[PDB]
């Protein structure tokens, strides 16, 4: 099954949900979710995974928090809804 970080990177590459997620500084790998439209993207993640319950942005962000220890995705300090993929994730 697709991993969360790959789902998000794929969305950014395809542009399919541009009103829910966007690059802030693509060369640095920083991206941000829409305050008003992030739930639609979270719903899509849960449906793609076949999860039992409806996915919420809060639960998806709880999964993102686990990537901070490994560095796969870091949450940008002093910003809201903003994250940064590692260089390794971006190298494909």
Mark the binding-site residues for DNA, compressed into ranges: 49, 62, 65
What is residue 86's DSSP assignment? -
Q: Return the structure tokens found at 34.
A: 């829409």
Q: Measured between alpha carbons, how far is 32 from 42 in angstroms, rounded to an integer?
A: 13
Q: Is 1 in the site for DNA (CB under 7 A)?
A: yes
Q: Is 44 in the site for DNA (CB under 7 A)?
A: no
Q: Is 55 in the site for DNA (CB under 7 A)?
A: yes
Residues in the site for DNA, rule: CB under 7 A? 1, 3-5, 35, 45-46, 49, 51-53, 55, 57-63, 65-66, 75, 77, 79-82
């Amino acid at each position: 099954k697709i991993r969360l970080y790959q789902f998000l990177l794929d969305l950014l590459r395809s542009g399919d949900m541009k009103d829910s997620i966007w690059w802030v500084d693509k060369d640095k790998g920083t991206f941000q979710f829409s305050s008003k439209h992030k739930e639609a993207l979270a719903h899509r993640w849960g449906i793609q995974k076949g999860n039992r319950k409806k996915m919420t942005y809060q639960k998806m962000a709880r999964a993102l928090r686990n990537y901070g220890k490994t560095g796969i995705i870091h949450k940008t300090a002093k910003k809201k809804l903003t994250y940064q993929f590692s260089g390794e994730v971006l190298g494909r």
